[PDB]
Nucleic acid binder design. Structure first.
Ligand SMILES: [Mg+2]
Ligand SMILES: [Mg+2]
Ligand SMILES: [Mg+2]
Ligand SMILES: [Mg+2]
Lengths: 52, 106, 65, 252, 88
RNA sequence: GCUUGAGUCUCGUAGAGGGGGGUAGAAUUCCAGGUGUAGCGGUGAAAUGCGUAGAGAUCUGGAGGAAUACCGGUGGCGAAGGCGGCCCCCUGGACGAAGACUGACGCUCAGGUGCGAAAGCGUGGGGAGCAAACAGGAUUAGAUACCCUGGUAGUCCACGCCGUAAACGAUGUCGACUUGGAGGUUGUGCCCUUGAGGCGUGGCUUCCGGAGCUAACGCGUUAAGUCGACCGCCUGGGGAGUACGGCCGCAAGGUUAAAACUCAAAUGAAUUGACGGGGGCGCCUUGAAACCGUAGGGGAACCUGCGGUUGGAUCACCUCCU
């Protein structure tokens, strides 16, 4: 078991767990209206690619 | 009347009184003129996380059709009886008689 | 899709830990239905089942507990 | 930041000030020459503070003004107006115009010198002036207007359109004058009791005073003072506020 | 929201036969029995406004049916409101 | 009289619909130790702050209040406001199935009545985390902001009140009709060779788009098309949803609601240059918040808290007849 291969295995596990992205975004409260707006904005920003 | 699942777990170090518990509760069911379609134990079984700082606690299932009243009696008997560490009661759609997958694995 | 639809058509399930394990992360989180290929009807049933299975310590909540 | 631009209202302000000898006059914030000149003119000699040392050089080097004033170059909130009142032989007339973040501090520093000041004469923004003179039963009323009306009688002088200022703001503003009472019409045992009573009350202005000043006094105290505890904080005159202050101080 | 058997008792009382359901008498009776029962619900569940929206629909539905029957036949109306004690 | 509208019944179905009561695993803070020791904490950097009385860290044990990671979706339920850990208890509505039954029982609705986010109020609890106000440290020409360390109300609960929100699909309610197309979701029938499939067939719902409509934008069988019944509302811009009166409210305020007076506009959509700061490669072309309700601060226009909405930005000079 090479230390730096166990490190790569660990890095894949924390990436698959997403935990840094979660604790990053969880840093503040939000007025629920803005994540509602951001959600539908992303939904149309996606749907525009579906067209060809 | 309402079919139910009743499913509960007992402290590993009180697992020996479990037959007495099956007596107490089955007597409540038949003493309510209710009926039973499964009774099962899955022995001492390991816990995904500690319950009351314990491990390996003893698991039990019943399939039942008793009137609602006595379900609240045996339910509150679980909060009286500290040998039962958890219970869940489910108002299931039907009486069901085919053994638990926990038994059928044997 | 239709093979995953058959998994729903065959069965509606709780206490089958062996099948529940097909739909969890190793960290104990529920898999999103699009990755399972299963239809939303069965996803709800699976989620409800997993929540019960966690309550009775049949499945962990997390990796640690 | 702002200073005035139009001679009509400059002349109106400096004339309404009535600045003449037989008065212990001192400017603060001389700013643009145009509005400091007529007051330094009409007073045979005048004292001034400018906060800025560069503007203090511009005006002290101006031969209209440097020979005709005595000039100081510091934050006025450091300045010992009680000694300047002694050096000027009688309590001061303090007056002018400023960037006015400092306004809230100015009033407290002026009130630290209610003995040493004969009167204050200053431009200010419309909302804070209308608050400062507000009658007890109004939304414009509140803790700072209470303390102001406690320390002094307060009097709007005249009101000025925004195009009148050198950088014209969006905001209309008025010159106001005020007078430290020769004897306090509201005698008080202490002002810190007023300040904390008023802040507690106005920090809670939407609820009943039973749920504001009655968090400290009892309802039987309040009604014993003749005050209905079911009122809101903005029903209450400075008179009964100083009565509460005396009650707090003397029953402590 | 009623047991089939309480429904059976009511329709076998107020109905023409077992083939009748939804004669005005059957309707207003079972509707009344439901309204009577739900007094016990709301006597605990004061804040259950979303449930009481259904109750308001039911009492007004009762009123509409009664008034139709009243103009259709006063005898059926009077003996029915007599049997149910309606206009209480 | 009738059964087509309306509506009852029998059997199923899906669902964060509501009300009530238990309960769980994360988490934060806090307390109690234990091990341990010079730092921690914070920012752009600082400072205030915390620690040699041992903090920070990390282990254990306990407390308490709050919220439900993931599923979770262009997804369901709900009149709307809104509704999301799990189980129970009570309870509302809806949709499909197949009959059976009543027999026009219908729709709309001025007054009226009731429900009604967020904020705030009333009475008595609770108070973890967060946080108007406030307090203190910073930043800045100034800074009231933006930054940080604190922090009350509030946020939570029961029981009253208020009754407003960009409470907006900015789109009244009900009914009929009128090309298509790709999905989603949830029943159901028949065929299934089964298991997948494949023919159907309701309900709900999303995005395209024909006709037609529309100032244009766009809407488009879930109309903004074609029409029938009733209700609500508007009549230039400001003054002004302001005055006054009445009503209502504990108070905030709500509500109904002027006029004088003043202006030749005010306004909606869309076109072309600026844009410009560019951005890419002379050429194509954009790294360039407003508000709503409500409560409070208050050098400003403003700053702050709560929660909703998206309507997220510019500005415009030298003549003419067939
Ligand atoms: Mg309260
Ligand atoms: Mg609230
Ligand atoms: Mg009004
Ligand atoms: Mg809303």
């Amino acid at each position: 078991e090479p230390f730096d291969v166990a490190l790569r295995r660990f890095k894949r596990s924390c990436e698959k767990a997403g935990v840094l992205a979660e604790v990053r975004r969880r840093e503040f409260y939000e007025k629920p209206t803005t994540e509602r707006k951001r959600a539908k904005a992303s939904a149309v920003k996606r749907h525009a690619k579906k067209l060809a | 009347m309402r079919h139910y699942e009743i499913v509960f777990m007992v402290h590993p170090d009180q697992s020996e009184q479990v037959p007495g518990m099956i007596e107490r509760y089955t007597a409540a069911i038949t003493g309510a003129e209710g009926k039973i379609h499964r009774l099962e134990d899955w022995g001492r079984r390991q816990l995904a996380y500690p319950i009351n700082k314990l491990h390996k606690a003893h698991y039990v299932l019943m399939n039942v059709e008793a009137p609602q009243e006595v379900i609240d009696e045996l339910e509150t008997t679980f909060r009286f009886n500290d040998a039962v560490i958890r219970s869940m009661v489910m108002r299931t759609k039907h009486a069901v008689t085919e053994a638990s997958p926990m038994v059928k694995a044997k | 899709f239709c093979r995953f639809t058959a998994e729903g058509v065959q069965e509606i399930d709780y206490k089958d830990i062996a099948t529940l394990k097909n739909y969890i992360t190793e960290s104990g989180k529920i898999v999103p239905s699009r990755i399972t290929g299963t239809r939303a009807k069965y996803q709800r049933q699976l989620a409800r089942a997993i929540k019960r299975a966690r309550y009775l310590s049949l499945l962990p909540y997390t990796d640690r507990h | 930041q702002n200073f005035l631009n139009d001679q009509f209202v400059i002349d109106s302000i400096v004339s309404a000030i009535n600045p003449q000898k037989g008065q212990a006059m001192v400017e603060i914030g001389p700013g643009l020459a145009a509005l400091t000149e007529p007051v330094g003119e009409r007073l045979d000699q005048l004292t001034v503070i400018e906060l800025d040392r560069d503007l203090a050089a511009r005006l002290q080097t101006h031969p209209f003004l440097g020979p005709k004033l005595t000039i100081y170059q510091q934050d006025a909130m450091t300045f010992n107006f009680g000694e300047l009142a002694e050096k000027m032989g009688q309590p001061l007339r303090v007056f002018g115009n400023l960037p006015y973040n400092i306004s809230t501090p100015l009033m407290f520093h002026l009130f630290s010198y209610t003995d040493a000041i004969a009167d204050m004469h200053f431009m200010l923004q419309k909302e804070v002036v209308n608050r400062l003179v507000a009658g007890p039963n109004s939304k414009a009323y509140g803790r700072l207007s209470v303390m102001a009306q406690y320390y002094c009688n307060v009097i709007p002088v005249l009101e000025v359109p925004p195009s009148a200022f050198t950088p014209p703001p969006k905001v209309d503003s008025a010159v106001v004058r005020l007078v430290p009472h020769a004897t306090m019409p509201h005698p008080v045992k202490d002002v810190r009791v007023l300040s904390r009573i008023t802040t507690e009350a106005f920090n809670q202005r939407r609820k009943t005073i039973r749920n504001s000043l009655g968090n400290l006094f009892s309802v039987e105290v309040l009604t014993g003072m003749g005050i209905d505890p079911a009122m809101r904080a903005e029903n209450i005159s400075v008179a009964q506020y100083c009565q509460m202050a005396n009650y707090l101080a003397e029953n402590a | 929201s009623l047991s089939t058997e309480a429904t059976a008792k009511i329709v076998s009382e107020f109905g023409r036969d077992a083939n009748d359901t939804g004669s005005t008498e059957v309707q207003v009776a079972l509707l009344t029995a439901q309204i009577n029962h739900l007094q016990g619900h709301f006597a605990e569940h004061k804040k259950d406004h979303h449930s009481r929206r259904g109750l308001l629909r039911m009492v007004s539905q009762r009123r509409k049916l009664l008034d139709y029957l009243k103009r259709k036949d006063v005898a059926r109306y009077t003996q029915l409101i007599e049997r149910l004690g309606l206009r209480r």
